Every structure is written in structure tokens, then in C-alpha cells.
């Protein structure tokens, strides 16, 4: 179910966001959806965190010069290797939480890679990506992933 | 700056960490275990200098070096996977020494 899966992506991202701190905590969280996605339409309708802070999401192009300054979160869809490199070159030196819709690898790029197949949405975390991200991630974020897989 | 922000960099064509780098990696693996992180995939990388074959084996040895440290740290051998990506997946620009520096690495990945 696309509807079920899209809402689950929303809930998992809200869970992940709750363990992330931005160096300047914005009044609204701005999310960029980049590249082809199947499960982002829940994000794109907007979300709200437990304390009432909104998450406002918009689609933006891979080659948008201002990706790194225009968002606090990026949700990355289907990108080839050159497009991915372009995206993260834009994010470099900016505090940006990155999540990819597909987790077929999680080797370079996004901090978190979703696996949106099967029973429950799980994810992997790349600690090297987290290290270059500019935001702070509490290790309890992995409880979520652990429990979803189990 | 936090256990989740963990980079592991290697010297030029070195597949082993120095005493101080290995020491710092140990307390990382210690830190991960203390927060139940439990299982890891380790992916080694290189710069793009030299033969593909050399680098691939080099990146494998880097990842295995990190694996040996996690095992010593007290993490179950079966819970550790090792891969080498050679030079295929750089995080930074190889045309500068600062970028090459960042490519000489093992990325710690925590699977669900």
C-alpha cells in the first residue's frame, strides 16, 4: 500500500528527527525532497513534531545551488552517482540531516538510509556521513531502527 | 563530537591505524557498544591513486583492521561484516590532498 508506506515513512522520519539537534534550532524545519521518490507524498503534505514545530517540505532539483542553505533536512530519492556527488557537494559545510528513500547501499552520502520494503520500515545509519553532516545525532535513534527490524 | 559522529581515517597507503588512531577507534567501539549498537558493517575506501586491484585489497585490509578492533572491544565476531569498495566511492575530491585524506577511510554502518 503506497498510502500505508508513505505514512510510515512520515512516522519514522518524525522519530529520527526527535534524536537530531541543529546548531541553530529553526522555528520551522525545512525539508527538501530531491530526485524521484515514491514514498515522499506524506512529507510533501507537511508534518508536525510532538512539540508543535512544523516540518515544511518542498521538492528541489539535484542541481539547486542553494540546497545546503535552503533546508534542514534532505530526503533523497533516485540519484545516480554524479547527481549524488553534486548533492553532497552542495550540503558540505551546512548543517543538514540527510535521509535516502532507498537503502540499497548506504555507503556514501545520506546519514540514514530507509528500507521501505516488507513488514516495517527500517534504516541503516552511516556514522561517517553523520560525522560530516554538521548536526548532532543522539545514539538512541538506533533504538527505533532496532525495534522496527524486530 | 558524539559517538554517532565517528570518522575513521587512514594514512596514505596504510591499511592499519597508528597507536593513537587505534586507541581512539577503540573507545568509539566501546562507546557504540555501551549504547547497544550491537552490529556493524565496515566499508573500507581508498583514494584513486594506484591500481584498482591494489586499492580494493587495500580497502579490504583497512576494514578488517577496524573489524579486529571492534572484536577486541567485545563485539561478537558474527555481528561484524567487512567490505572494501576500493576507490569507487569517494566522499571528497581526489584532486586535492585534503580530499584524498578524507577518502582514506572506513565507514562504520549500523544495520537494523
Residue numbers in the entry:
A (entry chain A): 40 to 189
B (entry chain B): 56 to 167
Passage from the reporting paper:
The tripartite signalling system YfiBNR in P. aeruginosa modulates intracellular c-di-GMP levels in response to signals received in the periplasm and is a key regulator of the SCV phenotype. The effector protein YfiN (also known as TpbB or PA1120) is an integral inner membrane protein that functions as a diguanylate cyclase, consisting of a periplasmic PAS domain, a cytoplasmic HAMP domain and a catalytic GGDEF domain. The third component of the YfiBNR signalling system, YfiR, has a key role in the signal transduction process by bridging YfiN in the inner membrane and YfiB in the outer membrane. YfiB can release the repression of YfiN by sequestering YfiR at the outer membrane, which requires both membrane anchoring and peptidoglycan binding by YfiB for full activity.
However, only YfiB(59–168) could be crystallized in a complex with a C71S mutant of YfiR; attempts to co-crystallize YfiB(27–168) with wild-type YfiR yielded poorly diffracting crystals. The resulting structure to 1.97 Å resolution reveals one YfiR monomer binds to one monomer of YfiB(59–168). The interface area of the complex is 1,053 Å2, with YfiB burying 1,024 Å2 (16% of the total accessible surface area) and YfiR burying 1,079 Å2 (13% of the total accessible surface area). YfiR interacts with YfiB exclusively through its C-terminal region. Strand β1 of YfiB is completely unwound, allowing strand β7 of YfiR to stack against strand β4 of YfiB in an anti-parallel manner to form an extended β-sheet spanning both proteins. Furthermore, both Glu163 and Ile169 of YfiR, which have previously been shown to interact with YfiN24, also interact with residues in YfiB, suggesting that YfiR uses this same region to bind to both YfiN in the inner membrane and YfiB in the outer membrane. The extensive interface between YfiB and YfiR includes a number of hydrogen bonds and salt bridges: Arg96 of YfiB forms a hydrogen bond with Glu144 of YfiR and a salt bridge with Glu163. Met59 of YfiB inserts into this hydrophobic pocket and interacts with the lining residues such that its side chain is 5.3 Å from Phe151. The choice of a C71S mutant of YfiR breaks the Cys71-Cys110 disulfide bond, but the Cys145-Cys152 disulfide bond remains intact in the C-terminal of the protein upon binding to YfiB. In this arrangement, YfiB binds to each end of the YfiR dimer such that the N-terminal linkers are situated at one side of the complex and the conserved PG-binding sites are located on the opposing side.
